[PDB]
């Protein structure tokens, strides 16, 4: 996930500044407005990003505005692959991560597991590869992000899904 959220799939006959005003009005609700990185060059037309205060804020604007109607075509918003330059200069409690990368970086895995209200710790099973167990200091947080992560993309070559650990 990311606090930098991608917002795209709108029209191009709309202006960068005008669509920025629309995005501000429609983004101060689901998150905070820090900066709207909008480029209307051809290599990235019809798209922009809003850098929201919280990563769950950005992904929640993405999951609520999962195709919200606007500007010639229902605009789609998701998290970004990384974060913006401002923020760059700045059901159970435990669940097994299946399709857990033998390649993932524990830093980004931690930012994923702590998307929720702070997780306890992530334990990428270092024996027989491709398993993990992550616990959250808030069990509702664990279940929330684990259900929203059922089928979650991280390193899109796979889907990293976490269900309630068994008995």
């Amino acid at each position: 996930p990311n606090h930098t959220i991608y917002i795209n799939n709108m029209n191009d006959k709309i202006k960068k500044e005008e669509l920025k005003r629309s995005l501000y009005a429609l983004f101060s609700q689901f998150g905070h407005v820090v900066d709207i990185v909008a480029l209307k060059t051809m290599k990235m037309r019809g798209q922009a990003f809003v850098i929201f205060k919280e990563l769950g804020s950005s992904t929640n604007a993405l999951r609520q505005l999962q195709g919200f109607p606007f500007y010639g075509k229902p605009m789609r918003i998701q998290y970004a692959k990384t974060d913006s330059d401002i923020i760059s200069k700045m059901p159970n409690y435990i669940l097994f991560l299946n399709n857990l990368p033998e390649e993932t970086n524990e830093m980004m895995l931690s930012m994923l597991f702590n998307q929720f209200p702070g997780f306890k710790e992530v334990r990428l099973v270092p024996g027989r590869h491709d398993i993990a167990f992550v616990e959250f200091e808030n069990d509702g947080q664990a279940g929330a992000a684990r259900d929203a992560l059922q089928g979650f993309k991280i390193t899109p070559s796979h889907a990293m899904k976490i269900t309630y650990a068994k008995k």
Binding site: I94, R123, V125, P126, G127, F133, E135, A165, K166, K167
Partner: peptide, 15 residues
């Protein structure tokens, strides 16, 4: 294969 005390009890008591 070996783990620590913590992880041992972790996966021990989570089944």
């Amino acid at each position: 294969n070996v783990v620590n005390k913590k992880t041992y009890e972790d996966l021990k008591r989570q089944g």
